[PDB]
């Protein structure tokens, strides 16, 4: 639901702000990212939210079904 | 920079104008005292190469597996201890 | 009348601001005097000191809070845990130095806050970070070992 | 009658062999 | 013919108190843009990085992380102040590339002497079907 | 590195050029429309992909078509 | 200069010609609804007076008349509540037996089997059990009569007519000029003294002459029929001297400053009245008199038509320090010329006030027999919590709107607004780090507890019986409050609330208020509250600070406060506007307030509310909070599954309406998920197919059907989400607390 | 009253009055003919 | 269950050793620059 509701723009600004933080935090400027941190793309985060939705759906129902049948029979 | 007034750009001095600074890094030879520096460079001599510092991680993972082989049971841990009866279940099962 | 928040080095177009914590003389002296900002001394001894500090750091949480915190032999098992933690942080340094120092990039350079040119630090190099990783190796396991020995020789524990 | 130690070890060795086959197939697919 | 103006490095900057949205680590190792404009009086404008700055009489020099920030500042100068300006692309090795008013006049006005590339002589619906360009590394619209 | 294309339905109203925030589009002389001007995209490397030009095109269907493609440090609009 | 009344004679004609044409207020809505987007924008921009006219005078007049109309609506609502208390309520019966008779002020018409909702509340009456607490408030005011409630309803209807007449008069006959609205000195001088101070003094007068004698007789125990009417208690000091002997000497000790003789009815004990479980009404009288004097003193601070007083601009501009540059330079001008900034400040402090009201009213009930009715207590707390959170989110929204529209960088150079805008990255990054740290050290503690319980290691989880996390500061603050009387509160005979410590206050066999102990679970849930509040602050503050501009989008102020995006470029700029920050902060406020009210209900059903049996206190759930509220499975099972049995088995009873709403709100919440997860292009293309189907049968509307806009879709989704979640919690809370207690 | 009746003819007023009269008609139908499960003639 | 020691070795191998080596290897390979 997190990726489903919120969209790419709040996260990009937040990541830019955190990149500003790390690029000029003392004792951490020794290391730097090889790949520039960016927000997930719109299609990518739609896919990620869908994947989490399906995984949570399946895990929740499998847990409930197996518990409510095996614990009872 | 040439920032004697309000001029913060200079192509002949483009190093300072871009913003590349040390912030806190300062150059100084004096820090660590004698004999101990040689002691520590001898302690970390041949290990500086990437392959041997990889081999240190290899023997670390060997220790990880040695815990599972003989080390988990030495600190007891319930996963290798004994068991106490059992439970039947909802109906006539086991 | 008194000015305490200023642009850094004059130009108001850089991301920092002069602030009485990011550039107060005591804190600036303390940050410059940390080993990680000693570009003059060899990176191996710097990594040794960093590893010693961090290895002696990591003992405590595992001692007081680990799964075997309530049994007498917590110190040895925590020394083992800290050895494993030092190894994994060591391979983190290995991977970082191998991926970010596979080539060269001599661009622009670096100067001080006053206007004097300074070398661009031997730590930021393939061979330099190898010495730092090797220093963190012997230092990290020694700090854990000294943390184990501190559990038996300290009076107040 | 549960299987023996030698059967488990032989199975694990054959799994190592088929792992070599698997990485050969993967390398061929990457090329 | 038209010649691009040189980037006069020793140009005064607007009065500003220092922001956090200014230059970062991209300026040192990739690129940072810069905008130059002529102001007829001392007056307050708005920075693209946040906050208010006072540009001074005469030449004003401001470096920005991205070209979009430079064009935002230029368009607000052109609308709220009727002030034109020049934007330059400055590489860290030293080379400076002229940017926005490339041929003197603004891009929304014709100049007769530009390059009319990326102008297809067909309609939207006259592109090729994707099956006819299959396994090519190109979209249907760049044929 | 975004593909921006101009098509002959362009009427030369210059609105796509005015809508561009990174100066990608410009007007070149043309003879296919009443205004005797058509849009062109010589600086697509500065294109971020915002599609503000498409939002300003009054032609149905629009004449300045932006195809999002390869992403660079300028197409992603990064200041870091 | 010179505060005075200035108005314009007959600015706007009164007729119905603009009622015929919708969308007249804005130019963009002219030339008819070509699409249904016009229909949606007509309601979207009805109150956006900035987009209707550019004149601050007309905006101010519209705001003033809208305030009058809102006051008329509130007066109609109050008249309806008093009329329902008069006609369709068991208020007189409840007055005789407030301990056992359940309050009710609404009955239903037997039409479709819905007469089952008329509960057997008691007193020979059938109706819906109300949880609003009007009965306790009326008993506190000393009504004890049906005719007086009807008279108050008629008076409130008259006041509503007066409000509507005032709004029409001040928009159409005598509309005040702009400089009348800008007399903030006079407005504060009259709101401090003439509104709040005089209102508190008048309520103290009513409480002295009406509430004290009638409620004193009720507490001593007398049927309300034979109690003397309020006027004859007010008419002569004889009966008052029988009840409060200090009235025999009248106003003489007041003017001679021998005020200590008024100590029988101007008291200061603290605690609760043991007969009713509410606060002592003499203490409330003393409180209202003291704050009335304080507010009337506060009403002379500012300078108007005479030389005495201090100007707000002068006080602001002189509060400048070395760390902040010019300080409060420009704040007077951006608050006397921008309505949205004042709306943001007032909404923030108003929501904080509502939350403080919720806190102070559960902690120590002010009305008689309010503590014993757990239903109205839980409902009042939860309602004020939700109103406070909503108003706070609106404060963030209007701060963002001011930043977009009414913020001028010319008159805001190097001031506090400029200083904050010039280092927004630091503030936002640091709030982000605080949010991450709080999220870890709050939620991961719960997850660790879940994992250790599920691994069979109860000694390793954070709990009172294992690894303790004790709120030592909060416990010591409770101890300081409990030890306050006789030490740091020498004139207090009891502590402010029994929650600090002491004996259990029991009224009618039920606990009014008992001490609350804080343990590990309370520590965890308070840190959860801090984390949720911090994330909501992060979203709202980020929207306000980056409303003007950004690294990604440098010209966000040009695109406006409410725009969907700036295209798929720069990786994607979806929800970059400050409006979408409000849209996300709405969900986060929902989450925060939901956790707060869950903690409230579980904590007081487990450790406060219950019955007394002369050997202990039997709580509603039985002390299960201390051993189950540190585990998410405990919240799901022992609170969210155990207490849900009352609302799902409510069919065939009076709580069947709560049972039905419990499912309908689930439906609405999941209906929100359509608008929140999907996008406009799909619905537009589907609408195109439906338009083809309509064209095939010549039934195409001339007003073109369009899919909801992106901002429209987000607004609909968040509205449905919050409505469904809040109504689910409301039905659950009310059914659970009215079935058991 | 032409403008007032035009306001009464506006879409929200007309739809609210129409759903009001339809709901009232259905309610009085159920008041006089309650519990009509089927169309038994 | 025959050879009870074997899970005690294999589970840390595929939970710590093999995953750490695989993650380090893939992190090295994704930024190899010149493969
Ligand atoms: C019957 C008397 C009357 C008449 C004939 C008018 C006529 C007019 N007024 Mg006016 N007004 C009146 C009374 C009246 N007003 C009162 C009592 C107030 C105080 C609230 C106002 C305050 C006011 C303001 C501030 C403004 C006008 C404006 C206008 C002009 C156009 C707007 C309009 O009416 O569109 C039609 C309006 C409606 C059909 C009604 C609006 C919706 C109502 C107020 C909702 C009330 C709440 C209601 C219970 C719904 C709540 C939710 C519900 C579903 C449960 C118009 C000529 C505007 C103007 O002059 O334009 C510049 C202007 O801005 N009026
Ligand atoms: C002692 C003088 C006094 C009093 C009692 C009030 C009271 C009030 N003002 Mg007001 N105001 C005053 C002076 C006063 N004002 C002056 C001098 C100015 C010019 C600077 C203003 C400018 C002003 C503005 C711009 C606004 C208010 C508003 C309000 C209302 C606040 C909202 C609310 O719901 O409160 C609680 C509600 C009640 C207490 C209900 C009681 C209502 C009665 C009728 C109050 C009668 C007081 C009135 C001033 C008497 C003179 C009017 C007379 C001809 C009938 C409130 C009733 C706001 C409002 O809501 O608009 C209506 C608002 O917009 N005031
Ligand atoms: C003192 C309170 C107050 C006031 C005076 C305003 C005033 C204003 N707000 Mg605002 N706001 C507030 C509180 C307030 N707000 C709160 C508490 C929130 C948090 C939710 C917001 C969040 C907010 C946003 C996000 C926006 C505004 C906007 C606006 C402006 C235009 C409003 C408009 O016409 O849109 C239309 C108003 C409506 C269509 C009314 C219906 C709104 C919903 C659907 C009603 C909720 C349903 C209700 C609970 C009934 C449910 C039962 C149902 C089953 C029947 C206006 C000046 C808009 C703006 O652009 O600012 C310039 C903007 O987009 N506000
Ligand atoms: C409880 C959640 C929920 C509900 C009720 C729906 C309902 C619907 N979806 Mg949907 N969907 C959901 C979740 C949900 N979805 C989610 C999470 C997703 C993933 C994003 C989707 C994605 C999706 C897609 C992609 C599509 C739909 C479509 C539809 C419609 C199918 C037609 C139909 O079955 O008629 C049933 C009608 C209803 C269920 C509405 C309820 C009846 C109302 C309440 C009666 C009105 C009474 C009253 C006046 C209500 C107003 C009260 C107010 C005035 C106070 C339907 C309205 C398809 C569509 O549009 O069909 C053409 C479509 O293509 N859905
Ligand atoms: C599409 C789904 C659906 C259907 C097929 C029905 C069908 C029925 N409902 Mg039901 N209902 C529904 C949804 C539905 N309902 C929903 C969603 C709710 C929740 C609000 C209810 C709540 C409800 C209640 C509370 C009751 C019914 C009742 C009834 C029965 C009464 C028939 C009648 O009114 O006499 C005949 C009506 C006419 C001859 C009038 C027809 C001509 C009119 C004037 C035209 C109207 C123009 C539009 C009927 C079999 C009643 C009953 O007793 O059940 C047996 C009753 O008490 N319904
Ligand atoms: C894909 C099938 C599969 C799966 C899902 C599992 C899963 C599991 N095995 Mg098992 N195993 C398998 C095949 C499989 N095995 C086969 C065919 C053999 C015969 C040689 C064994 C022999 C074996 C032994 C002796 C033991 C386990 C054990 C275990 C458990 C811990 C893993 C471990 O430590 O052992 C490591 C597993 C191996 C060394 C061999 C597995 C090789 C499989 C076929 C790889 C398949 C990968 C798949 C096709 C693609 C995924 C991508 C991947 C390559 C990254 C775990 C639940 C331990 C246990 O009992 O736990 C209590 C244990 O000691 N397995
Ligand atoms: C998927 C495989 C896996 C495996 C095999 C383990 C195994 C283990 N975990 Mg771990 N864990 C995992 C995944 C896994 N974890 C994941 C995915 C998470 C994130 C959710 C965690 C989070 C986690 C936490 C928070 C903790 C553990 C702990 C432990 C240890 C249990 C206590 C003990 O045995 O005493 C001690 C273990 C040892 C003595 C063996 C390690 C050191 C040996 C001696 C080799 C060191 C070599 C060096 C050179 C000396 C155990 C070795 C606990 C622990 O002890 O911390 C380390 C504990 O605190 N795990
Ligand atoms: C299962 C897999 C196991 C794999 C194990 C590989 C280990 C790495 C390896 O062999 O490195 C090979 C290198 C040899 O390099 C080479 O050593 C050569 C000497 S000789 O060949 O070894 O004689 C030398 O000439 C040459 O310069 C140098 O490169 O050996 C070292 O230099 C390792 C020395 C490590 C010393 C510090 C150890 C940790 C200290 C702990 C402190 C606290 C203690 C409590
Ligand atoms: C809470 C922190 C208190 C510390 C505190 O606020 O001291 C107050 C400090 C001093 O400001 P001044 O004395 O300049 O303020 C006086 C007037 O100018 C106010 O405008 O203000 C700040 O430094 C704000 C930055 C706080 C940074 C928070 C981290
Ligand atoms: C949080 C968030 C982000 C921020 C992106 C984040 C935080 C990604 C960072 C995740 C880190 C890397 C941890 C992820 C852990 C995963 C389980 C690891 C998976 C890796 C695979 C190779 C297996 C967006 O960019 C975004 C964009 C559009 C809509 C919604 C969102 C959104 O919700
Ligand atoms: C369903 C859906 C639509 C389609 C929605 C439409 C076409 C609106 C339907 C409204 C109809 C026409 C009116 C129905 C009236 C009801 C009987 C009561 C509605 C409540 C009103 C009184 C306010 C979108 O347009 C959309 C856009 C962006 C993101 C998500 C979505 C989305 O999920
Ligand atoms: S907006 Fe469209 S029609 Fe106008 S010049 Fe640009 S491409 Fe041509
Ligand atoms: S997906 Fe929608 S909100 Fe996001 S960039 Fe595209 S049009 Fe804008």
Atom nearest to B77 CA in ligand 7:
34
Would you say the CB of residue H27 lies under 6 angstroms from ligand 5? no
Contacting residues for F23 by C-beta, under 8 A, at least 6 apart: E67, E71, E99, E100, E107, F43, F46
Residue keyed to tokens 């850089």: C14
> Which residue of E12, E24, E28 is in closest CB contact with B6?
E12
Is B9 in Cβ contact with E28 (below 8 Å)? no
Contact F23/E71 with Cβ under 8 angstroms?
yes
Does the CB atom of residue G259 touch ligand 4 within 6 A? Answer: no
Q: Which chains touch A (3 or more CB pairs under 8 A)?
A: B, C, E, F, G
Count of beta carbons in the 10 Å neighbourhood of residue A12: 27
Q: Is G619 helix (H, G, I), strand (E, B) or coil?
A: strand
The Å distance, Cα G394 to ligand 3 centre, comes to 8
Subunits with 3+ Cβ pairs within 8 Å of G are: A, C, E, F, H
- How many domains is chain C partitioned into structurally? 1
Question: Which class for G71: exposed (0-12), middle (13-18), buried (19 or more C-beta within 10 A)?
Answer: middle
Indicate whether C44 belongs to any domain: yes
Tell me, what DSSP letter sits at residue G174? E
Q: Is residue C48 part of a domain?
A: yes
**Contact across the interface for G567 and F47, Cβ inside 8 Å:** no
CA end-to-end distance (rounded Å), chain F: 18
Q: How far apart are CA G91 and CA G137, in angstroms?
A: 11
Q: Determine contact: C5 vs chain G, CB below 8 A.
A: yes
Q: Which residues from chain G sit within 8 angstroms of residue A20, using beta carbons?
A: 425, 429
Kindly state the helix (H) or strand (E) to which residue G611 belongs, with its residue range. strand G610-612
- Locate the DSSP E strands across G203-310: none
Q: To one decimal place, what's the resolution in Å?
A: 3.2
I11 touches ligand 7 (CB under 6 Å): yes
Nearest CA residue ID for atom 45, ligand 1 = G69
Please state the φ and ψ torsions of residue G7, each to the nearest 5 degrees.
-140, 170
CA distance E49 to C12: 11
Decide if E3 contacts B3 (C-beta within 8 A): no
**Is residue C14 one of the residues assigned to a domain?**
yes
- Nearest chain E residue to F29 by CA distance is E112
Q: For residue A32, give how far its alpha carbon lies from the nearest alpha carbon of chain C (Å).
A: 8
CA distance G366 to G360: 9
Q: Which residue has the tokens 């700090």?
A: C143
- Let me know if residue C1 belongs to a domain: no
Residue ranges of E strands in G48-159: 104-106, 119-120, 126-129
Choose, out of C4, C10, C12, the residue to mutate when testing the contact with E (most E CBs < 10 Å).
Answer: C12
d(CA H18, CA C58): 74
Token duo for residue G569: 């470029």
Q: H or E element: which one contains G506? A: strand G505-507
Distance (angstroms) between ligand 13 centre and the Cα of G708 equals: 14
How many other CB atoms are there within 10 angstroms of residue G202's CB atom?
12
Unique residue bearing structure tokens 């009058």: G68
**Please, which residues have CB within 8 angstroms of residue B77's CB and are 6 or more apart in sequence?**
none
A vs C, Cβ pairs < 8 A, gives: 17
State if residue G348 touches ligand 3 by the CB under 6 angstroms criterion.
no
Pull the structure tokens for residue C20. Answer: 């009485």
What's the B72 CA to ligand 13 centre distance in angstroms?
Answer: 54
Q: Is G15 helix (H, G, I), strand (E, B) or coil?
A: coil
Residue D12 belongs to what H/E stretch?
helix D5-30
| Cβ neighbours around C22 below 10 Å, total | 16
Half-sphere exposure of G593 (CA within 13 A, CB side): 30
Please name which of G489, G487, G485 lies closest in space to residue G501, comparing C-alpha atoms.
G485
CA of I13 to the centre of ligand 7 (A): 12
Q: Is the dihedral of CA C143, C145, C148, C154 positive or negative?
A: negative
Is omega for the bond preceding A28 within 30 degrees of 0, making it cis? no
Q: Six-digit token pair at G284?
A: 């409330």
Q: Which one-letter DSSP state was computed for residue G336?
A: S
**Taking the domains of chain E in order of start, what are their residue ranges?**
1-143
Q: Give the side-chain half-sphere CA count within 13 A for F58.
A: 5
Q: Which residue has the tokens 């009319």?
A: E116
Q: Which of A24, A27, A31 sits opposite C96 (nearest CB)?
A: A31
CB atoms within 10 A of CB B34: 7
CB G734 within 8 A of CB G714: no
Residues of B with CB under 8 A from a CB of E: 2, 5-12, 14, 17-20
Bind-site residues of A for chlorophyll a: 2, 10, 52
What does the alpha-carbon distance between residue B15 and residue C120 come to, in Å, rounded to a whole number? 12
Q: What is the residue whose two structure tokens read 């031997």?
A: C122
Residue G214 near residue G142 (C-beta atoms within 8 A): yes
Domain that holds residue C120: 6-153
- Cβ C107–E28 below 8 Å, yes or no? yes
Instruction: Indicate yes or no: CB of C6 within 8 angstroms of CB of E18.
Output: yes
- Test I20 with C102 for CB contact under 8 angstroms: no
Task: Let me know: does A15 contact G428? Beta carbons within 8 Å.
Answer: no
F77 and G569: CB-CB below 8 Å? yes
- In the block, tokens 């309609």 appear at E123
Rounded Cα distance, G42 and G659, in Å: 36
Q: Determination method here? A: cryo-EM
Could you list the residues of F known to form a binding site for [4Fe-4S] cluster, using ranges: 10, 13, 16, 20, 47, 50, 53, 57
Give how far the C-alpha of residue A37 lies from the chain's centroid of Cα atoms, to the nearest Å. 14
**Is residue E141 left, alpha or beta, with left meaning phi > 0 and alpha meaning psi from -120 to 50?**
alpha
What 3 state SS string does chain E have?
Answer: CCCCCCCCCCCCCCECCCCCCCECHHHHHCCEEEEEEEECCCEEEECCCCCEEEECCEEEEEEECCHHHHHHHHHHHHHHCCCCEEEEEECCCCCEEECCCCCCCCCCCCCCCCCCCCECCCCHHHCCCCCCCCCCCCCHHHC
For residues G434, G436, G438, G440, the Cα torsion angle rounded to the nearest 10 degrees is: -150
Give the minimum alpha-carbon distance from H4 to chain G in angstroms, rounded to a whole number: 6
Pick among G421, G429, G636 to test the A interface (most A CBs inside 10 A) = G429
In chain G, which residue's Cα lies nearest the Cα of F74? G570
Element (DSSP H or E) covering residue C17? strand C17-18
Nearest CA to ligand 10 atom 28: A8
Whose CA is closest to atom 37 on ligand 3?
Answer: G44
What is d(CA D24, CA D21) in angstroms, rounded to the nearest whole number? 5
CB-based contact, F70 to chain A, within 8 Å: no
Where residue C20 sits, what CATH number does that domain have?
Answer: 1.20.1240.10
**Which helix or strand (DSSP H or E) is residue G511 part of?**
strand G510-513
Please indicate whether, in this complex, the C-beta atoms of I2 and D9 are within 8 angstroms of each other: no
């Amino acid at each position: 639901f997190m990726f489903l509701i919120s969209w790419r723009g709040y996260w990009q600004e937040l990541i830019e702000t955190l990149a500003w933080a790390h690029e000029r935090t003392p004792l951490a400027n020794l290391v730097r990212w090889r790949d520039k941190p960016v927000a997930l793309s719109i299609v990518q985060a739609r896919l990620v939210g869908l994947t989490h939705f399906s995984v949570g759906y399946v895990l929740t129902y499998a847990a409930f079904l197996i518990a409510s049948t095996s614990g009872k029979f | 920079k040439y920032g004697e007034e309000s001029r913060y750009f200079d192509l002949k001095d483009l190093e300072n104008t871009v913003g590349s600074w040390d912030m806190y890094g300062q150059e100084d030879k004096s820090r660590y005292n004698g004999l101990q520096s040689e002691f520590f460079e001898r302690a970390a001599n041949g290990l500086s190469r990437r392959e041997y510092i990889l081999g240190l991680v290899a023997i670390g993972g060997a220790g990880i597996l040695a815990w599972g082989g003989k080390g988990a049971a030495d600190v007891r841990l319930p996963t290798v201890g004994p068991q106490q009866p059992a439970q039947v279940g909802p109906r006539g099962r086991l | 009348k008194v000015q305490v928040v200023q642009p850094v080095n004059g130009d108001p177009f850089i991301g920092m601001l002069e602030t009485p914590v990011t550039s107060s003389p005591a804190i600036a002296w303390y940050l410059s005097n940390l080993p990680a900002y000693r570009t003059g001394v060899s990176p191996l001894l710097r990594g040794v000191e960093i590893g010693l500090a961090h290895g002696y750091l990591l003992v405590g949480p595992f001692i007081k809070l680990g799964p075997l915190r309530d049994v007498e032999n917590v110190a040895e098992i925590v020394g083992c845990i800290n050895g494993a933690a030092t190894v994994l942080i060591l391979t983190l340094c290995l991977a970082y130095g191998a991926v970010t120092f596979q080539g060269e990039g001599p661009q622009v350079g670096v100067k001080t806050l006053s206007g004097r040119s300074i070398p661009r630090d031997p730590l930021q190099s393939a061979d330099g970070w190898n010495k730092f990783t090797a220093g963190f190796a012997v230092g990290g396991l020694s700090g854990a070992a000294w943390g184990y020995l501190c559990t038996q020789i300290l009076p107040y524990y | 009658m549960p299987i023996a130690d030698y059967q488990v070890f032989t199975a694990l060795f054959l799994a190592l062999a088929t792992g070599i086959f698997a990485v050969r197939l993967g390398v061929a697919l990457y090329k | 013919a038209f010649t691009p103006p040189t980037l006069q490095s020793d140009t005064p900057s607007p009065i500003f108190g220092g922001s956090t949205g200014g230059l970062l680590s991209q300026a040192q190792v990739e690129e940072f843009h810069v905008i130059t404009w002529e102001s007829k009086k001392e007056q307050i404008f708005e920075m693209p990085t946040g906050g208010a700055a006072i540009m001074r009489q005469g030449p004003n020099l401001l470096k920005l992380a991205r070209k979009e920030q430079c064009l935002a500042l230029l368009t607000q100068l052109r609308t709220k102040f009727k002030i034109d300006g020049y934007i330059y692309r400055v590489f860290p090795n030293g080379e400076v590339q002229y940017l926005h008013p490339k041929d003197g006049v603004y891009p929304e006005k014709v100049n007769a002497g530009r390059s009319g590339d990326n102008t297809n002589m067909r309609r939207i619906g006259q592109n090729k079907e994707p099956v006819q360009i299959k396994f090519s590394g190109k979209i249907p619209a760049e044929f | 590195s975004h593909t921006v294309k101009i098509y002959d339905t362009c009427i030369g109203c210059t609105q796509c050029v005015r809508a561009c925030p990174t100066d990608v589009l410009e007007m070149v002389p043309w003879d296919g429309c009443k205004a005797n001007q058509i849009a062109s995209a010589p600086r697509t490397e500065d294109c971020v992909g915002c599609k503000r030009c498409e939002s300003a095109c009054p032609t149905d269907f629009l004449s300045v078509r932006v195809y999002l493609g390869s992403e660079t440090t300028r197409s992603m609009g990064l200041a870091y | 200069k010179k505060v005075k009344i200035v108005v314009d004679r007959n600015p706007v004609a009164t007729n119905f010609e603009k009622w015929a044409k919708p969308g007249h207020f804005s130019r963009t809505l002219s030339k008819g609804p070509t699409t249904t987007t016009w229909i949606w924008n007509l309601h979207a921009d009805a109150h956006d007076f900035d987009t209707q006219t550019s004149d601050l005078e007309e905006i101010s007049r519209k705001v003033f008349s809208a305030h009058f109309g809102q006051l008329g609506i509130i007066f109609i609502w109050l008249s309806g509540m008093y009329f329902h208390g008069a006609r369709f309520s068991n208020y007189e019966a409840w007055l005789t037996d407030p301990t056992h008779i359940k309050p009710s002020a609404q009955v239903v018409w037997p039409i479709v089997g819905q007469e089952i909702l008329n509960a057997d509340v008691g007193g020979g009456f059938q109706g819906l059990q109300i949880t609003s607490g009007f009965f306790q408030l009326w008993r506190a005011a000393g009504i004890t009569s049906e005719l007086q409630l009807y008279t108050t309803a008629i008076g409130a209807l008259v006041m509503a007519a007066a409000m509507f007449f005032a709004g029409w008069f001040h928009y159409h006959k005598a509309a005040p000029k702009l400089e009348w609205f800008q007399n903030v000195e006079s407005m504060l001088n009259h709101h401090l003294g003439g509104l709040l101070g005089l209102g508190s003094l008048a309520w103290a007068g009513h409480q002295i002459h009406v509430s004290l004698p009638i409620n004193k007789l009720l507490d001593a125990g007398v049927d309300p029929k034979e109690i003397p009417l309020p006027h004859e208690f007010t008419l002569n000091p004889e009966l008052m001297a029988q009840l409060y002997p200090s009235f025999s000497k009248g106003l003489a000790p007041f003017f001679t400053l021998d005020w200590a003789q008024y100590s029988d009815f101007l008291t200061f004990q603290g605690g609760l009245n043991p007969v009713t479980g509410g606060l002592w009404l003499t203490d409330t009288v003393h409180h209202h008199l003291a704050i009335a004097v304080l507010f009337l003193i506060a009403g002379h601070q500012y300078r108007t038509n005479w030389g005495i007083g201090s100007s707000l601009k002068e006080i602001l501009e002189a509060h400048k320090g070395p760390f902040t540059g010019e300080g409060h330079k420009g704040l007077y001008e951006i608050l006397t010329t921008s309505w949205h900034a004042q709306l943001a400040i007032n909404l923030a402090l108003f929501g904080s006030l509502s939350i403080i009201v919720a806190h102070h009213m559960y902690a120590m009930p002010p009305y008689p027999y309010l503590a014993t009715d757990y239903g109205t207590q839980l409902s009042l707390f939860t309602h004020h919590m939700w109103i406070g959170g909503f108003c706070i989110v609106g404060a963030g929204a209007h701060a963002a709107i001011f930043m977009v529209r009414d913020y001028d960088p010319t008159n805001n150079y190097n001031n506090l607004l400029d200083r904050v805008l010039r280092h927004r990255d630091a503030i936002i990054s640091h709030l982000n780090w605080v949010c991450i740290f709080l999220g870890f050290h709050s939620f991961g503690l719960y997850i660790h507890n879940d994992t250790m319980s599920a691994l069979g290691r109860p000694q390793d989880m954070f709990s009172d019986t294992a690894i303790q996390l004790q709120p030592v500061f909060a416990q010591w603050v409770q101890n300081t409050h409990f030890l306050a009387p006789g030490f740091t509160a020498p004139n207090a005979l009891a502590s402010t609330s029994p929650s600090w410590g002491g004996d259990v206050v029991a009224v009618g066999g039920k606990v009014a208020m008992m001490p609350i102990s804080l343990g590990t679970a309370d520590f965890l849930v308070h840190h959860i509250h801090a984390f949720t509040i911090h994330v909501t602050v992060l979203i709202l503050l980020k929207g306000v600070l980056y409303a003007r501009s950004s690294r990604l989008i440098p010209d966000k102020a040009n695109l406006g406060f409410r725009f969907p995006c700036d295209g798929p470029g720069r990786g994607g700029t979806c929800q970059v506007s400050a409006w979408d920050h409000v849209f996300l902060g709405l969900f986060w406020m929902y989450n925060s307030i939901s956790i707060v009210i869950f903690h409230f209900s579980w904590k007081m059903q487990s450790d406060v509310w219950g019955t007394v049996s002369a050997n202990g206190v039997s709580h509603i759930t039985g002390g299960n909070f201390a051993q189950s509220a540190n585990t998410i499975n405990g919240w799901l099972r022992d609170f969210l599954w155990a207490q849900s049995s009352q609302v799902i088995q409510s069919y065939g009873s009076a709580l069947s309406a709560y049972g039905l709403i419990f499912l309908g709100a689930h439906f609405v919440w999941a209906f929100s998920l359509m608008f929140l997860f999907s996008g406009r292009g799909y619905w537009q293309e589907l609408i195109e197919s439906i338009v083809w189907a309509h064209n095939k049968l010549k039934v195409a509307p001339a007003i073109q059907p369009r899919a909801l806009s992106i901002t429209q879709g987000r607004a609909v989704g968040v509205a449905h989400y919050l409505l469904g979640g809040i109504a689910t919690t409301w039905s659950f809370f009310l059914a659970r607390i009215l079935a058991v207690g | 009253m032409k403008d007032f009746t035009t306001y009464l003819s506006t879409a929200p007023v007309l739809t609210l009055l129409s759903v009001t009269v339809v709901a009232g008609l259905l309610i009085e139908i159920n008041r006089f003919f309650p519990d009509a499960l089927i169309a038994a003639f | 269950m025959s050879a009870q020691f074997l899970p005690s070795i294999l589970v840390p191998l595929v939970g710590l050793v093999f995953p750490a080596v695989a993650m380090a290897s893939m992190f090295l390979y994704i930024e190899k620059e010149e493969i």
